[PDB]
Amino acid sequence: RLWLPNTPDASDPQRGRLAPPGELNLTTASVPMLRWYAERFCFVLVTTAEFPRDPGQLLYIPKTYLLAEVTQLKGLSHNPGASALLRSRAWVTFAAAPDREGLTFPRGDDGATERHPDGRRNAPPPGPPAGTPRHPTTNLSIAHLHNASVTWLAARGLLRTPGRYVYLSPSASTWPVGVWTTGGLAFGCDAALVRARYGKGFMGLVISMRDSPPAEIIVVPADKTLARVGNPTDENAPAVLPGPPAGPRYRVFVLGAPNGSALDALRRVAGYPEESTNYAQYMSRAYAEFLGEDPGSGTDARPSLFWRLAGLLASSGFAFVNAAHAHDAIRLSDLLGFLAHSRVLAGLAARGAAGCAADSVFLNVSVLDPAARLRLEARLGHLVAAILEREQSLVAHALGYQLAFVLDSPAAYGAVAPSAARLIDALYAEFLGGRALTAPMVRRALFYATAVLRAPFLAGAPSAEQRERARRGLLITTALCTSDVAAATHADLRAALARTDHQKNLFWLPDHFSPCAASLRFDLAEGGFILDALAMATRSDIPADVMAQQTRGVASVLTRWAHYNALIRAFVPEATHQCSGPSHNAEPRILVPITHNASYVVTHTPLPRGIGYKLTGVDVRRPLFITYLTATCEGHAREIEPKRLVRDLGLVGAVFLRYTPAGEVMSVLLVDTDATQQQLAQGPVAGTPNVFSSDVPSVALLLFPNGTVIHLLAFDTLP
Amino acid sequence: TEYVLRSVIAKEVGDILRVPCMRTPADDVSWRYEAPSVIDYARIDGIFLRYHCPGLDTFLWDRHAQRAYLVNPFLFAAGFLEDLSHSVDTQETTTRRALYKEIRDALGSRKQAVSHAPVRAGCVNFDYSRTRRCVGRRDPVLALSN
């Protein structure tokens, strides 16, 4: 083909300076033939829509004519990000910064104002007091760890030392930003990835989900302005990105606003960085927003929620690394809590809001200097060892669990695993004793200790010793979670949230832990339990139909929380070969792993395999079945035969089950020791309120480790 | 698993003009232009803004390398214009404003081609234009991901 573009002429009053170098002899007769290369020159062959009728022009320019805290890098050279933009599909297949039609991001309360540059409802992280020392992370003693709420480490040399860094928005629709990075926080699972990049004066945050479009927030000093780059329709002036109006220290920009609530969440998110300087206030609101999740989506993703949660955690890491540099110090209690709660929230967000499975959650925090981190982790490992030997305190052993949790290492979880199992055992004895496991210090210990006995399942492939240890902890926490404890745990949480203002009075989920969230009880949101939770509730100013709905939602949070695929996978015996017929797979309402070999499962339907018992005297509309599963395809129906007792009767290891005609299961108590076996062989002494007696008309079962289920006549309570 | 629009072997100007208009791969596909590691103008001999193509094919010719890189039409346009708008004289700059107004004119010729497609679903790392597989803990030319 024939190319004959219109080179200009030195005379041209307009494109004249663009005529070709004499050298070339670019006459109208020569311009085909190509041969447009001239060393000292760059040529631009422009052609428009009307080609060939308009043969397009050939322009010539000499090559030489082309040659503090948070800065936009504009142009193609010598912008390091240039290449990444030029590779992108921006504006080719996506529009990452669409035309905003009056899309508005209102200013918000708590939003930093000229009066309060940190926030209206901010509660600033206090400075280390006058003349307090600032040790290195090496001379760290167990005594330090105990007075840890008042032991300060100097941030310099512990914190990552800032160094220049270029941030490329994933949209490729914004100029690269040059910053001094202070590290980052990233987390995700098999169905979501969030990545925050911190810089002095800046945060770069991408939230992505499997089945939802991404969200991007870019936080910068208030006097900076970020344009949307590459949209040809903004030839006059580039279209500044949408976002909230600029506060006192920060201005926030957003990409990929839209679908009602998606927009709402994203407003909340662009609001978060200006609201506080205390990593804690974010954590608190995070743990609160997590208890408010709607039951309806089930185990599906909740994009609205996850955005709010992920933005809260990223924002807390921003407040944390910021607060540090500020008064150049980190309270040891804050370092440990930040590392612990980061790990805790990232999991609750990914599991409850991104629809994921715990065995896939990950979290890479990197606000610390890498070398200092390795040192810190080595020392902490050693104190985990020391604590378990030197100290006797419950406070100390729970610090040892929480330390293993922060390290998230097999070695760590190794030292403390026996300790945690032995504690769980002790609490069951306190509960069988008649006491309540309500002291905050106790719940926090129960929280991390169950976390510890669970960790091997999440890392895959547990040892025989590791399975046995967790199985017993599950038989126990399921026993601890009676109907009464459940109803109570609704009242406590309701009362806890009421008390919090997210500043002076924070809300730490771990301190309000219940066995229910680490049980194998997934019936907690059924009808009979909501009624329990309501009759033991304090009157409020919420319509009855709503308070009931609010309850069901929290019931559902606790069951979803407690439901780990990896555990169910591990304590429901499957057969070695495929079983004929259509599996009637009913999801276990209660799972009782009574022997390492076998488990009982409580469901609303017969299963096709296993010894199956059908509970009698139970409302036909909401029936109860107890099935004894082992690795076999065989099934047998069996009647539940009645029995009386009466020095060793062989009850130990068996499980006591109380259920109502209403179809509710009140307690699944493990017959632990011999003392508990005798407490049972006597009967239900009047005026001796065991955990084995109820005032509610109900039937008593005893489930033996070997598959037989009997009817403890003597423990029934009639109307 | 993801793809690249590789460079074209280009020893002569015609090796470029020969090349037919790039067709746009499926929505299925995760592709990316192969661009130069860095944009150096003392290393670019010709710029082919072929805006008569449905995809605004723009080619960056490095003669010494004998490669022509096909790159993002819109971001190249935006960026190159910017680099020309920089003050860095009067002849030097008058020439520049010239080439500027002439590029900007042809770009606007096609301002109705920019996408309206909202960015699609799936995890990002670290570029919408890279692959969107979700990675977890239990973990037209090809570049299988690592």
Ligand SMILES: *[C@@H]1O[C@H](CO)[C@@H](O[C@@H]2O[C@H](CO)[C@@H](O)[C@H](O)[C@H]2NC(C)=O)[C@H](O)[C@H]1NC(C)=O
């Ligand atoms: C599973 O274990 C229990 C253990 O008590 C067995 O119950 C026994 O059944 C006999 C039948 O006459 C009774 O004397 C007692 O109720 C039990 N004996 C003991 C040892 O206390 C039950 O039969 C066992 N079932 C299987 C399948 O072996």
Ligand SMILES: *[C@@H]1O[C@H](CO)[C@@H](O)[C@H](O)[C@H]1NC(C)=O
């Ligand atoms: C260009 O053409 C002129 C006139 O024919 C001739 O004198 C000259 O040699 C040519 N220049 C080159 C570089 O070939």
Ligand SMILES: *[C@@H]1O[C@H](CO)[C@@H](O)[C@H](O)[C@H]1NC(C)=O
């Ligand atoms: C383990 O499983 C087998 C087969 O299900 C069973 O026969 C055996 O009794 C079990 N072992 C123990 C220690 O109970």
Ligand SMILES: OC[C@@H](O)[C@H](O)[C@@H](O)CO
């Ligand atoms: O019942 C619950 C179990 O987890 C399922 O695998 C099957 O129903 C067993 O038959």
